[PDB]
């Protein structure tokens, strides 16, 4: 079975090749986006593997079918990229990443927190040139502080586990309180309490129409001066204009954000008939204790191996049968 892989990054290739040892496919790696124009490159491949920015609508799918491709595989969860009606109709079998790694994500959140806290990113900038000055690097001791987690699904609980290790007082907000969280000693509270009492706040929840801009001006008003905020969840959970103001006011002490790729563009705000919006990343990073990562939360070897492992197992079946539920039918 021959698989064409689009939007390939070096990490994608490394892990796919390693996982492929136990499936045996012939792999062809392309660094470029799958588009209507590039679909033809798949010719000769029974299948293609795509990621969040690849184009999966009918026009692309038509080209693929024309070129003999049967199976499409997302190394991925987000599908706003693909036009799913067509595939079934075109006789084209399909999939995504159902399982994902909660620990990788939680750990990333913690890592962002610690880096910000101890200003380790800044320290590195200095010490890489043998500048050992400590001015401006002072952090806070975690132990005995209060941590507020918004959302107690697997990721949120994984985070709480770590925060418990730090010896923090643990608070949480979730509409659906979890035994797993209670067993850790977490106290579930309303948002207002969480905002009021938390030294560190971390978002681990899905975006809903209800929680759009959950962290807004009113919310910031409730928080402690110098509060640390981490968002490895969707960008829309935070009103960016309000966060910017709160940073300027010094209400927010530190802010860490893992930026989703198709939110990067709409990230954001002011511009005067200027200046969309890499400028915001630059300014905040320079002027505040603000740290951005580029949707990096799942970027560990173990997490990547898991994504790969499956991707191959699915195709191997498809190359012959199963439910899948690789398959989205």
């Amino acid at each position: 079975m021959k698989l064409a892989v689009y939007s390939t990054k070096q990490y994608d290739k490394k892990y796919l090749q390693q996982v492929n040892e136990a499936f045996g496919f012939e792999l062809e790696f392309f660094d470029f986006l799958l588009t209507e124009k590039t679909a033809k490159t798949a010719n000769g491949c029974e299948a293609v593997c795509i990621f969040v920015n690849d184009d999966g609508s009918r026009p692309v799918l038509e080209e693929l079918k024309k070129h003999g491709v049967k199976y499409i595989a997302l190394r991925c969860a987000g599908f706003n990229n693909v036009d799913l009606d067509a595939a079934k109709e075109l006789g084209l079998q399909v999939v995504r990443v159902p399982a994902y790694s909660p620990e990788a994500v939680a750990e990333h959140a913690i890592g962002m927190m610690m880096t910000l806290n101890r200003r380790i990113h800044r320290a590195y900038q200095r010490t890489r040139d043998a500048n050992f000055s400590l001015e401006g690097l002072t952090g806070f001791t975690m132990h005995g502080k209060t941590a507020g987690v918004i959302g107690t699904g697997k990721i949120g609980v994984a985070a709480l586990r770590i925060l418990k290790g730090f010896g923090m007082r643990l608070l949480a907000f979730d509409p659906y309180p979890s035994t797993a969280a209670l067993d850790l000693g977490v106290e579930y509270v309303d948002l207002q309490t969480l905002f009021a009492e938390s030294d560190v706040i971390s978002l681990h929840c899905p975006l809903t129409p209800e929680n759009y801009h959950l962290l807004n001006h009113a919310a910031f008003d409730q928080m402690k001066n110098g509060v640390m905020i981490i968002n490895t969840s969707r960008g829309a959970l935070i009103d960016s204009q309000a966060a910017i103001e709160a940073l300027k006011n010094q209400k927010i002490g530190s802010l860490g954000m893992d930026v989703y790729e198709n939110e990067r563009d709409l990230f954001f705000e002011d511009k005067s008939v200027d200046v969309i919006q890499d400028d915001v990343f630059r300014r905040l990073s320079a002027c505040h204790n603000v740290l951005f990562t580029g949707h990096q939360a799942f970027l560990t070897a173990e997490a990547l191996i898991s994504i790969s492992e499956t991707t191959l197992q699915n195709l191997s079946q498809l190359e012959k049968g199963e439910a899948c539920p690789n398959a989205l039918f």
Copy 2:
């Protein structure tokens, strides 16, 4: 009483002043080093407060006494910079802060680990300029990995609590196994075992003649390829020449080191007629997944407050003629 503070940094001043509300000393802050030449600036203070780089040799002490100084407070644990015998003969009293907050230090070790693991230091260099490329940033999932801690005093135990939080398998080496550790599910093992099995290793122990160059060529050879090593303990725990080789060979995956001041200028071991360093810090940082911090482990507000409280409390006892448990001699 009036206190002259030398080698003053902004953090030193902020926390000393804040703590001093409870004490009422008259504080005078100097940014420069105490030396034989600057000792005269103390004139009119009964006490001086110094840090690791300040010069406490006999000639300095002699000048201080000449100028009416009775008391010397080290706002740090180390005292090798001060000639204690001379101080005793001269009638001076010397006091110190015997330990730093264990939690602050452990948390710093963990922070170095995570920053290294996820290459967060590298990411920032990118994203500060709006470059979101992930190439080279790939880390490891901590959960289920094995952590080995060498030394289970308060700092090591504090680290172990955090590591337990990550859901790691916890191994340790210490001559005197601690119930507090055992209570965490820690398994104590010999060094050979700890070296063979640990994905991450962190040093939380005093330097002894016995453990000089504990992490040496034989130790590295034993370790897992890609191992992460953290040292917030003294530098001599590690044979640097061996570490540098291990990095080159890709035995050591990641290395984080909190570099003590009295220990930076001294890497050698060795070279010829051209030429030496801060170069090693620059090269390693550039070429490997290596992070140095400048003795930053105790640099938190809470830890600095503790240091400030102890220091003023020590001074307060000396002023009164009350025996000070933090005195370095009679």
Copy 3:
């Protein structure tokens, strides 16, 4: 005519589109490399435009021919990536940009030199973080120093003009002395003399069998301690190992190199027992007063406009059947 542009960077696109206002080509821009696999994307185009990394080997050319391509335009001087014998046989026509703007390249060399001299690159690393320390930034006054230029073709002469403006003594080495250089007041000399007396040295010459490793251990021995060396010419002009030792020795004070794409892996050092050969860039940049740029010497709007005009003109001449002096056969 419709033209497919491969390996497209934003700058390529901006200037090609700007220039095309005068030509009316139909332009299709691709970000990815031209390869045997991607050559099919050119279907519908009479021409393609490529750069130094694109693959112009016979298998690729065969694909392009099958797909209706007639013309290949190199938006660069180099053509090592294109198999000219094959192209001829296949009836394809190949054109290039014969030279870059001399002023742009010369200015880049001077820019490198001044940045290094005043450690401006270092200063920015500091001041971007509001660190105004000057330690380690001391340079040298150019006025009254001696510059040596190796090669006095158009670029070398442009460089000399600038150097003259700094109030420097001008020396040069060329086997074929130039009237414009002589008219400027340049004194031609032997290499040994140029090495012995030059404060600053800049390489502006083509690579030849003769000058391979022209700057070698013996050359570095003859130089002044603290000498500044600039190479915007090909990498092989310098023996890297020697250069590395000379930096380590402190014979070479400063080194600036504009690194050619194809020559990127070749250079430099021992090196690494496999990946990565990039570490040399990292090491030298951190440990010494060394500056690398990525073949940036022609990267000005004006130079890019010239490349764009030449390319579109070359293509019109081809279509019209006129003689194209830029043709590679």
Copy 4:
């Protein structure tokens, strides 16, 4: 004579020592600031050498006198930190370095220009990590563009020579004409014309009432979109609020500023109310093609040697009872 040197940086020491080979002063170097408190450190010295940040006010001067100092040498042009009246009254003599090497300053201005033009500072941040991407680095060819110099004293003229070498067309605004400049082919013009026609502008003039905020909203409006501006002259030549707005609007393509020690606050936006700040420097540097240097324009070995010779020579003349042209009063 023994000379105490305050606020010493490694470069000050190196060049002062090198020059002293021919003078034989006895030199004592202090890294710290001269203040009322540290003036006593000078006892045993007839002279002290100070720089722009050192405290020269009456109380300090009084201390110096008490401690036997007769001479104060400024290793710089500015002297606003020194209370000249008090000095004269106290019987102290003060000398300065009247001007920096014109070539060094002009060369600095050109260096900033080229670095900004080709985004070499950005490039280095990339290539230091083997990132050879060229996106965003595109510059412009200098040759055939127009350069406008504001001020045609020795520095402006030195800059013109260089700019001439680039093949640029030379414009200048100075009320007063320069033989050297005319001789160079320069065209004098009014400010409005200089503003309209210049691709690059560099300021090389002293601050006067007449040019306070010379580059103001109105001036920027006249300028070419994308224009490059360099200021190695004093800050108040530019209305910073107007400049910042002009950067935001994209009227100014690039801005290079050598920032005087005494002037960090001149440059401001702003709404960083909490709390008044170096933030402007961090922000502009990140968001625009902006480059700051810390009053670096004279930082070359030759320029420093000149400062050093002048300073030692002033001191020598003072010792002699000779007329020092560089004295600030008599």
